[PDB]
Design a protein around this nucleic acid. Structure first.
Lengths: 86, 131, 61
RNA sequence: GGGAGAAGGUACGCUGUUGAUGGUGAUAGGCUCCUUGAGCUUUCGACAGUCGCAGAUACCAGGCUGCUGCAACUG
RNA sequence: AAACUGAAGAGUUUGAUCAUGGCUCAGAUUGAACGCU
RNA sequence: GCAAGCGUUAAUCGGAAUUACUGGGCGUAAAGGGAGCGUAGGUGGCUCGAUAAGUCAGAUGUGAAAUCCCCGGGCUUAACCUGGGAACUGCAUCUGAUACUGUUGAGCUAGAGUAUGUGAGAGGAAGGUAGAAUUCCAGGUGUAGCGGUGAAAUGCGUAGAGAUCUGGAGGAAUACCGAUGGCGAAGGCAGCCUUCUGGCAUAAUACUGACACUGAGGCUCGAAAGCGUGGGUAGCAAACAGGAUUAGAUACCCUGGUAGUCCACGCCGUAAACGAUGUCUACUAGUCGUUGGGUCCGGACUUAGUGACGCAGCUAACGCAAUAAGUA
RNA sequence: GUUCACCACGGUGUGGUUGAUGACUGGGGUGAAGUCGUAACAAGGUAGCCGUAGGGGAACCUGCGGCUGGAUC
């Protein structure tokens, strides 16, 4: 998984405001970290379809938040995807 | 999801009237309060008050009427749903129960009765039929 | 059948074909009897009904 | 993968003009480098003319299709 | 002044029933044909 | 009954609400996609403004005449002809209104999410392991049957079976717990342990601020059987062989028995894949169970499921009924 | 007038789409004093049905999984 410590590290890096932990930036960053970490699990467990269902839902949620953020403020979206390599 | 706020309010009134409820409360909006005000002025409901609650919310509470055991609102049907909106001209507004009912019309001069819109020579969205 | 479904797809009235194709939408039609015979009716009835096999000007037999 | 060069078409000589283009490097300028490019040579084209029966003119250099039996094939 | 007036069903699945559902019929129309007159 | 016509045939609409826009349906009559994710599209919370595209109204121009309809007029009447209207639901351009939809600026938190603590679970994937049992192999005891059936027989057994005891090999499944119990989107998922891992439920606070719903195509997953390749192979068992039963018996019953069932990796993409009930919202008497929480004082309330009833309402009826087939 | 350019007819080759016919062959229907059975409806005499596989003169049977639209319990 991701520990509480590195989850809070990601939160702190992408804080738009003080202890917000809810903006599209921090949400997308946390989803990105979780997906990139779960890649390790699914390389060793290819037939884990029940877990892959949740990972696909993570991908879908990140895509929804990225499109919403792009439609809201395009500078923030172009900055966020550049930071996250998307 | 909930995508018909007017239809939700009308269904709340209809279900409470079928359940013989004294009053029905719902989340308030200005359009809902206007429709309730037209119902009060038409005499279909006893009153409608907006109580401003916390968190910038409000509750519209409507007191219902019952005459001779039966509900005063014999029928209340949404006409122009979100999936199919209906707009009519001054001489095209549908009459409800030969005129003994009310067609709620949202015109440019506000939300009024179909007979009021006909008197004003105006048209608009036909939102509901209440009889 | 929602309003959107009706506008996207629509309603379809299939068209019944004529029960008398050999007339070709004519009141009558001329032919030559290629056979004059009799035949027996369906189950309730019994008779020797008089039939003619006729080739019409429309190309049907 | 193929069948396939399936089948079947069209152009093709010479003369003049002309566009592009590869190589090599004289000459100048700053066993080497860069720019420039004389002369020589490569490859595609275009346009105009011209002669004959005939321009891949000689030698050289697949005939091609349809159905069907057998054996998978190279050997 | 007026142009603002308009809406019928029946038969047939069953021992019988209700529903569904097709088929059929009563109307109007025609650049019509045919039969009798 | 029509009548200088009357019937028939052809043809269109009607009746047909029988393609249902007006104006139908999909639990069982035909009809919910196996399930989900999602693209285009459709639809979409609250408050204050802007705009005026949709919308509404007015003006103007046009919408040929004829036809249709209304009021008249002329043929002796009528058909017919004719004057004036009405209409031609339309389009264009300006003007005005801003309730709603569209486009926009700002704000809000109630829909939707995030962080943090606890909890339940046969959710998934990879390994390992345990004990009962079967089968087989090898021995000890022992002797004449075993097995099977409605009865039998085939079969096994005097080359020693079956039974009983002791060792060994191997595969598969996981008794009890066990529960209209739980988890999962469905398909599904039960010994125990570890590793990797998804979702959910729950308390409070903080946060984002409409980020939503649904979804043609598309993709993913998807019982069992089946297919490819390589393993494995105890039991069971299509096919198959035999014995019965029977007129026959390509069956049911019996004795055997190979594929398959198991594993790995790929196909397949179907099921009465069912609740024969698409997803998501809100609202509408109640009563009694049960699973996971939570908060109070053994009870009470509340939550997310999962069941049995039962009003109103709905239904052709059966029945459904807050887990609707009710109201939208 | 000549010549070139454009171009209609006409020609050549190779395909596509489609109609009618075709020995033979497949299923579908209709027809009566037929032949063989008796598969379904009752627990239809082995509950039925669904998917799939194998088998069989034929209705069908058998395995695996599923459903109740199953009696009796």
């Amino acid at each position: 998984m991701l520990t509480n410590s590195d989850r809070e590290q990601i939160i702190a890096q992408y804080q738009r405001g003080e202890n917000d932990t809810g903006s599209p930036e921090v949400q997308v960053a946390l989803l990105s970290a979780r997906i990139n970490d779960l890649q390790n699990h699914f390389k060793a467990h290819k037939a884990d379809h029940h877990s892959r269902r949740g990972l696909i839902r993570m991908v879908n949620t990140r895509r929804k938040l990225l499109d919403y953020l792009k439609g809201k403020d395009l500078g923030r979206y172009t900055t966020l995807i550049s930071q996250l390599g998307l | 999801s909930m995508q018909d706020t007017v239809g939700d309010m009308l269904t709340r009134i209809r279900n409470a009237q079928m359940a013989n409820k004294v009053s029905v409360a719902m989340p308030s909006s200005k359009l809902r309060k206007s429709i309730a005000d037209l119902l009060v002025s038409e005499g279909y409901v006893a009153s409608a008050v907006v109580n401003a609650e916390e968190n910038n919310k409000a509750t519209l509470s409507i007191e219902l009427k019952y005459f001779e055991g039966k509900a005063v609102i014999e029928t209340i049907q949404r006409f122009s749903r979100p999936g199919l909106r209906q707009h009519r001209g001054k001489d095209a507004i549908p009459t409800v129960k030969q005129g003994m009912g009310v067609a709620i019309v949202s015109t440019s001069q506000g939300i009024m009765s179909d007979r009021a819109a006909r008197a004003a020579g105006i048209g608009g969205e036909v939102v509901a039929f209440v009889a | 059948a929602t309003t959107n479904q009706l506008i996207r797809k629509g309603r379809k009235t299939i068209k019944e074909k004529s029960k008398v194709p050999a007339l070709q939408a004519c009141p009558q039609r001329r032919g030559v009897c290629t056979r004059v015979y009799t035949t027996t009716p369906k189950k309730p009835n019994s008779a020797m009904r008089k039939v003619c096999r006729v080739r019409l000007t429309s190309g049907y037999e």
